[PDB]
């Protein structure tokens, strides 16, 4: 299937407002989801709306959250999110991060107790359009073995980064700290496809090619992805006084209960270090020079990080967002779950 | 051979090579730290390279340090191409001081030599009760994912956080699969190398270390984005040479390296209870080490644990 950005937004906003979210909250949630789809990050796209709807109606996601922005220092704050939708809480936090970095050069803001926030690179792009460097990270559903391990501990804790170049240019990098996303496993379950042995592991911690055998995911680059997801958990969970590692709520544990997730934003105003105009020129030069690199045999081109997603996002404004078929059929009707 | 022994030795040699005693001790300290943890890539195998560079003026023996505070939580240490160990340590001290008072600190080290095992600097912060993050630019040596030309270096990243009592969690990683000192190592071994480490002039993975032109990024585009990020944060942000422009170790022992490093320090009290934080950090380390190992493994380590142990028993 294929529809435009604006229609898909409308549909998602409708389905979510119908579940019981306020109008503007559903708009924000929708905004973050279509962003993901437009960039080809479909696991954080419209596919999640049905799940979101059920949790909203059962009161797992708060539809009347009492936000409280606690400012703890000149460059630090916690947004107590009262288990609001994650897309909403995270963006609000980023907006406070932005104005703080604007005034005082740097900002570190935790988002305390929120639902799933979607593709977190949305929030760092926010910092970048304001002319700042953005870094963001959050906890996730426990699904990954430690390096050398056979029991679940951390989630697929994502990390994203963005910085501005000249004009509208933005360099956006995001990464999962696992080899692959859980959805790719359920999709090969939904195929009787057999998966690569580098993705995942059975209940004994032995890597497997049987998606039905899969109990947990492997961390990217062994101990490295392991350390990175540890760091993200410490920074967006332990730092905020939230449940951590093993303790983090799983997706389908209790649809009537808040996730209590944590997210951390870090924003840096380049003006507080050197010329922001030269910074932006150097970002734009980086992107050009990397894209001009002689590709290895096999490769058509070298991308600068996130470039392929930027290209997809741009091809999407012209041609429309690609979307797996039935999600569309769900979106129009009157049924939530 | 004791710890105060190599230190006093290296302190001596480097002070002979040109450095202030205060500077020689600090460089010694950091080289001493690294060997203990089995980070031989940065241990005292490097004293003579350093000594040469010091004597030849390619490291500033009389740096005009300038700490410019740019905001309540930001600063640049203008390092005048001083030894990186000295510069990085100094900026960390200011970053710790700043986080302690205002809760957060982002401090750039502008124009310094190689700083060594950068995990040393985040441990400083953790010892002070804070979270520490550090990262820096490196000698260009790595192809971009899909690339046949060099752009970024093995730009490392480090992170430490305090536990209960004297426990510290310390994690560091190179953004490449392997370091250059296993490639030159494999030529003196004369020994084939895994095809995961490096490529030839055409960017084709190679088993022949004499045919290595460039290293590969860890996890392809992921380590690639990470070394980019580190370059932007520790170089572009500071208005320093970046990417391909970054200087190499061996180009010119008379020339300042002009590297950058970035420190980020966070005071847990500005977010939650430090007591609970440290308790939970210690819990994490315990729980992870107690996880059932996968076959092939004798244990699960919390990140850095094996090095933490080495610098107990090497002492």
Author numbering:
A (entry chain A): 1 to 337
B (entry chain B): 3 to 317
The paper states:
In the monomer, AllD has 10 α-helices and 13 β-strands, which fold into three distinct domains. Domain I contains N- and C-terminal regions and consists of a four-helix bundle (α1, α2, α3, and α10), two antiparallel short β-strands (β1 and β13), and helix α9. Domain II is the central folding unit, with seven β-strands (β2–β3–β4–β12–β5–β8–β9 in order) and four α-helices (α4, α5, α7, and α8). Domain III is made up of loops, one helix (α6), and two short β-strands. Overall, Domains I and III, which protrude from Domain II and face each other, are localized on opposite sides of the central β-sheet in Domain II, and these domain orientations generate the inter-domain interface on the top of the central β-sheet surrounded by Domains I and III. First, conformational differences were investigated between two subunits of AllD in the apo form. This analysis resulted in a root-mean-square deviation (rmsd) of 0.45 Å for 315 corresponding Cα atoms, and these differences were evenly distributed throughout the structure, indicating that the structure of subunit A and B are essentially identical. The apo structure differed from both the binary and ternary complex by rmsd values of 0.54 Å for 337 Cα atoms. Although the rmsd values between the apo form and the two complexes were not significant, large differences are localized only in Domain III. Structural homology searches using the program DALI with subunit A of AllD in its apo form as a search model indicated nine structures in this family, with Z scores of 36–54 and rmsd values of 0.7–2.7 Å for Cα atoms.
